[PDB]
Point group: D3
Chain length 160, copies 6
């Protein structure tokens, strides 16, 4: 090849094993995995950018090649700047498919050199979303099956 | 990082620009690309195995890293025999999404070392299929927009 | 307006109240409606081309400006030949939507002066198809709510 | 036997997908009838009698599940037997749209039968008879998808 | 009270679509609990109290239906009261995908609760609370869509 | 035929080439086209009613038969006042289809004299929404391919 980077964009509010299975399935497929998050999203999520970045950073410790960045402008500009010709997105459902088809179509208009590549969520994590883990957290049920140790502790302390 | 082979499977009956677009977009992302055809399916169609393979070769000759192969037996065993750790499939529409989700779930049960990735069809080929191209060729309308020139000449011939 | 014609294609095997609904809602919007069927289908359903046209002919007798025709080749060519600028189709479900999208994108590349307009099935006929009416008829249940009196007689005869 | 549920299907052959639906049903009704259409046509792979034999053995261990065949309309088998309820499984959007059409028709055929749907378990969602059989045709392992006695019938048939 | 079924929702307000699901269940279990969530958020249009009142009146002809509020997990409610079945309606593809995600979670949350679905009847497939309110804000006729008691409550609220 | 009016309702926040293509494909099939906007929609967007109205008027001025209006009240009550028997909408994907099915089922109960007709998005406009054109405009990327020039000017101003 050459030297190979893939970007894995997301909100990760918070990161879950669903998101991790995708990053983990990407690690020995590329040289460098950049987990990437949006700055001044203007939405507002349960957790701040910083906490979100640290929750990722602690969850992805056991994988050397994964970095965690933030940005700024267009994601396709990031891939341009930094040497990645490949974006990785997961699919859980028809819903995801539709939303991603319109984004990829726009991105391919913005930068024809970048490709987006999809992976199907695996079976035991396809119903996982952070929205719904956050909901279960609010009722203080056991989330240990859904998110890693660190973000588990960050949601207990958030919902009490 | 290590050598990468991707397998791009299909019946290619015949190959279309839609198929070509997916092969082209993957060439700079893997070291080797195997285009795989199903040796002796019991599901016979317009062109012979051998006609189909030649049409691929002629349409893929401007791409040095693309080889065209035939196999009977399970697809995940072909990948295993040639060391390919990745299958590549295109997605046109929701119906594709669903059928693909089902096949990838079984292929993963068959051999969990092989990962399937997807690319979305380009907006301009999203409606192309072998099926709809053959129908159009049977009323000998013009198909130069839909298949490469070798395939075009073979369609006018077939439906003369 | 001009002298306007609209073409309403299909298999009609047999025509149902579902089809007739679409036809009736169209008849006051164009000077002339053409119900068109493909000749030499090499698809064979249950009723021959001749039977199918007679059924259509008897079911639309009460609308002066509807005509029944057969063709030959490409739908957009019939439209070109007869001076029609509009194809009309019905939509029952997402399944219909996705299929019809693929077909009109192609018809657009074949002749961009023909437009296709869609109508939603009315609520009471959304679940009707020729296929499921045929199955009901095999068990000789009452289909009078699904097909018009003449198609009904043709169906009772066909299935005993 | 105050309540009865019918679980109709081709079952060509039955799989752990079908069987999970049946298992999740047994404790909610007094009696479960698994029904298969007699004098269908277009079969292949297994005959009616083979298909019935395969099901009755895979459900042996569920004391309230009986296997029957019928050649008329489902909704009539139901009124024949006293069942107020049909049970079907959903794996995907395509099943959902298919079943929406069947049940709208079924409701014009007989307004007192209800059809209740259960989502396929996450582990079995990808399973169909069609694809178990592709896999068996390449002599690959299928114990994770069908019960042992169905597995054996499949090896015999695909050598 | 051998068998209980829980029918959960916002019911903001209840409509004939919801009632048709509720009515289609009553003959199938001994006891139906329409439940609603205490301490919600995003609402509007009617308060918890007004909502439970409208339900109560709308189902008073159904001896075995009770309306309850609850503050925890739907799946907690069920175990506590002995309900092993939850019932939900499907109008459309979008409902199917959303509900797949919920059931998959609830099944992790508790494994002895089934969710069973029923298809909307064809006459009520396009009815939602959302769109009924829309049409009542413009003073159109909603009597085809909601029961007479909820009609009056809509008329008042929107003039 | 008699004199025909079609209404094409929308937020148009802003109008895009996607909307316009629809409008243009309708001009030849009806006598008058009223492009209509809701007057005090209480979920405000990026342009006011006044701006949106100006932006349309400029964009459709070559199409003499197209007129811009605003209404307070039901869409079908507007159609009744002006004598329009037809409403026209465009569909880009599955989610448009389902949403539109439910709206039209209701509109048919409110007034069964009005027909809603549907047209598929042309392929190159399939991924365009106002939404995604604004997000791209906020990051100051070229949007001239997505909207006509008058509209391109205003969001250069709005996101400067
Ligand atoms: C497929 C990856 C992706 C995902 C998304 S996400 C989204 N969809 C809708 C909204 C929106 O309306 O804000 N955002 N957005 C995009 C682009 C879509 C087209 C417009 C520009 C978007 C873009 O590049 N935005 C900045 C960004 C920066 C860093 C990260 Cl990590 C991300 Cl995800 C996005 N491509
Ligand atoms: C995503 C690639 C793919 C595509 C398909 S295609 C298809 N799935 C069902 C039917 C059928 O029933 O006829 N056909 N089939 C498969 C496998 C799916 C799981 C069962 C085994 C399938 C398998 O490996 N089959 C042989 C084969 C060999 C070499 C080639 Cl190149 C191909 Cl494509 C297939 N994976
Ligand atoms: C939406 C109207 C329509 C419906 C269909 S229906 C169908 N038949 C087979 C397929 C297929 O293989 O997709 N689709 N086929 C078509 C065309 C799709 C583009 C390829 C050419 C098709 C075409 O023009 N085919 C001849 C024809 C069909 C119907 C009638 Cl009435 C006539 Cl006169 C001629 N457009
Ligand atoms: C909801 C179960 C069901 C299923 C089906 S058919 C199917 N759906 C998926 C597959 C499949 O995957 O093979 N087949 N067909 C029907 C009816 C549809 C309306 C027309 C009458 C049909 C009717 O009553 N037909 C006789 C029948 C069918 C099945 C059995 Cl068991 C019996 Cl005894 C009688 N309702
Ligand atoms: C299928 C019934 C249902 C419906 C919903 S509804 C909804 N609320 C927010 C969202 C969401 O963020 O998705 N979904 N939420 C749920 C649960 C899904 C699993 C996570 C926990 C949810 C849970 O148990 N919530 C409490 C509740 C209690 C009693 C009533 Cl009556 C209701 Cl409606 C909800 N299951
Ligand atoms: C497809 C045309 C259309 C589009 C929409 S849009 C929408 N549906 C839900 C929401 C909502 O909940 O806010 N909005 N709403 C409608 C009607 C659907 C039935 C209820 C009443 C809606 C109606 O007539 N509304 C006023 C209106 C006036 C003038 C214009 Cl131009 C429009 Cl678009 C709408 N039909
Ligand atoms: N359980 C999962 N399995 C596979 N992919 C996932 C999973 N959850 C999320 N993803 C994908 O990971 C990418 C980034 O996810 P997010 O942006 O964090 O999800 P989101 O839509 O912003 O909020 P959620 O996770 O759906 S509530 C998207 O492509 C998601 O579809
Ligand atoms: N126009 C296209 N754009 C992107 N991918 C495509 C396109 N056409 C086909 N593919 C994908 O290429 C892979 C192999 O396609 P084929 O198997 O050869 O097509 P097929 O499904 O057998 O018959 P058709 O008529 O092409 S759908 C599948 O994942 C297809 O969905
Ligand atoms: N019940 C219905 N309501 C509205 N449109 C319909 C209905 N049935 C069929 N149509 C449409 O009429 C056109 C002709 O369909 P056909 O070709 O006759 O039937 P078909 O779809 O090939 O076979 P079936 O059994 O009707 S699915 C297509 O747009 C159909 O989707
Ligand atoms: N894996 C599964 N999980 C849950 N339900 C299922 C599963 N497989 C089948 N079903 C349901 O079982 C009922 C009857 O199944 P079948 O009629 O035998 O469907 P099918 O024809 O076996 O699928 P094939 O491979 O096309 S034959 C239908 O409502 C199915 O959707
Ligand atoms: N017309 C209908 N027919 C059958 N079921 C319905 C109908 N309308 C709503 N439902 C079901 O009612 C259940 C709970 O009621 P709701 O939670 O209020 O639905 P909702 O989507 O949350 O609110 P809506 O969309 O404005 S009705 C949902 O899961 C729906 O599937
Ligand atoms: N690109 C397009 N091509 C064809 N029709 C479209 C397109 N975009 C929107 N429409 C349709 O025209 C009407 C939409 O007007 P609007 O929805 O109010 O604006 P918009 O482009 O959908 O961006 P949104 O509404 O924020 S998603 C609906 O019928 C849309 O489906």
């Amino acid at each position: 090849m050459e030297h190979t980077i893939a970007v894995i964009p997301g909100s990760f509010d918070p990161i879950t094993y669903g998101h991790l299975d995708i990053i983990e399935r990407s690690t020995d497929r590329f040289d460098e995995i950049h987990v990437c998050v949006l700055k001044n999203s203007k939405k507002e999520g349960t957790f701040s950018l910083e906490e979100r970045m640290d929750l990722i950073e602690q969850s992805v410790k056991h994988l050397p090649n994964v970095k965690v960045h933030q940005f700024s402008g267009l994601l396709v500009d990031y891939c341009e700047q930094v040497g990645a010709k490949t974006i990785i997105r997961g699919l859980r459902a028809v819903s995801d498919f539709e939303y991603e088809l319109r984004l990829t179509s726009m991105n391919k208009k913005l930068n024809n050199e970048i490709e987006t590549l999809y992976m199907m969520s695996s079976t035991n994590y396809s119903f996982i979303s952070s929205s719904i883990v956050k909901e279960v957290a609010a009722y203080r049920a056991d989330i240990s099956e859904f998110v890693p140790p660190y973000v588990e502790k960050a949601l207990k302390k958030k919902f009490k």
